Design an enzyme around this catalytic site. Sequence first.
Site, PDB file in Angstrom:
ATOM      1  N   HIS A  57      -9.834 -13.699   9.709  1.00 63.74           N
ATOM      2  CA  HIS A  57     -10.524 -12.708   8.828  1.00 63.74           C
ATOM      3  C   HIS A  57      -9.767 -12.549   7.503  1.00 63.74           C
ATOM      4  CE1 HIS A  57      -7.133 -10.169   9.456  1.00 63.74           C
ATOM      5  NE2 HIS A  57      -7.631  -9.244   8.634  1.00 63.74           N
ATOM      6  N   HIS A  72      -8.162 -10.335   2.124  1.00 62.43           N
ATOM      7  CA  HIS A  72      -8.223  -9.565   3.438  1.00 62.43           C
ATOM      8  C   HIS A  72      -9.664  -9.046   3.606  1.00 62.43           C
ATOM      9  CE1 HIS A  72      -7.644  -6.308   6.422  1.00 62.43           C
ATOM     10  NE2 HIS A  72      -6.330  -6.077   6.250  1.00 62.43           N
TER      11      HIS A  72
HETATM   12  O1  PO3 Z   1      -5.122  -6.132   8.460  1.00 64.78           O
HETATM   13  P1  PO3 Z   1      -4.946  -5.082   7.460  1.00 64.78           P
HETATM   14  O2  PO3 Z   1      -5.793  -3.859   7.511  1.00 64.78           O
HETATM   15  O3  PO3 Z   1      -3.914  -5.212   6.405  1.00 64.78           O
END
Ligand code: PO3
Lengths: 150, 77
Positions: A57, A72
């Site tokens: 992801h 991200h």
């Molecule tokens: O995976 P993430 O919310 O930085």
Amino acid sequence: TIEIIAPLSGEIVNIEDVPDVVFAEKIVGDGIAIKPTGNKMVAPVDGTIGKIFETNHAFSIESDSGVELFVHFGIDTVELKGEGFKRIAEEGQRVKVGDTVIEFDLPLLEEKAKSTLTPVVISNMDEIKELIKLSGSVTVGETPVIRIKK
Amino acid sequence: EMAAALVAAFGGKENITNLDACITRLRVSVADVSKVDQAGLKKLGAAGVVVAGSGVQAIFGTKSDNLKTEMDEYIRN
Ligand SMILES: O=[P-]([O-])[O-]
């Protein structure tokens, strides 16, 4: 001047408006966020994929121009354990702008992800002279989202 | 070794009830939050510390996932 091309389609949003203090406070770097409207994430620059999260992801890529980016998708999306994503590229893969890296299920993520806001930041902040954030709607692998110098 | 120090900062290996993270945040569950060394986390290079309920979050940056892998192995070995 280096132009970072949109990794996915959507509307540009302020990174300080992302519901995550580490991204909003740019602890992981500076850049912008995108409210997604498409179904795939491509390379925002010509370079080499660095690392793809095991949940497929988020990924890291280094441009040939020496800029390190980090995409991200959504917020806290790792908790979905890969559901809705399909890694299409491999780590270490050399890519050109627009090459597909991951395809996702927008409707499924819009329903299960805490947020689909997708931060695209530069983790190389100490090596760039200036970061000009752009505005408006973008089209995956076509519309520039950031302009950097040195 | 930094992984062992992180475990000690949370209180200890037996004080860890769960391990999980995302891209730039590390989530560690603790039995007693009063035993977490916030100052110890800062010295380890943590950018900041956030506590929510019994869950404790520490910002190690993008390399946060590296600590998760090392802590998982050290805590399971
Ligand atoms: O995976 P993430 O919310 O930085």
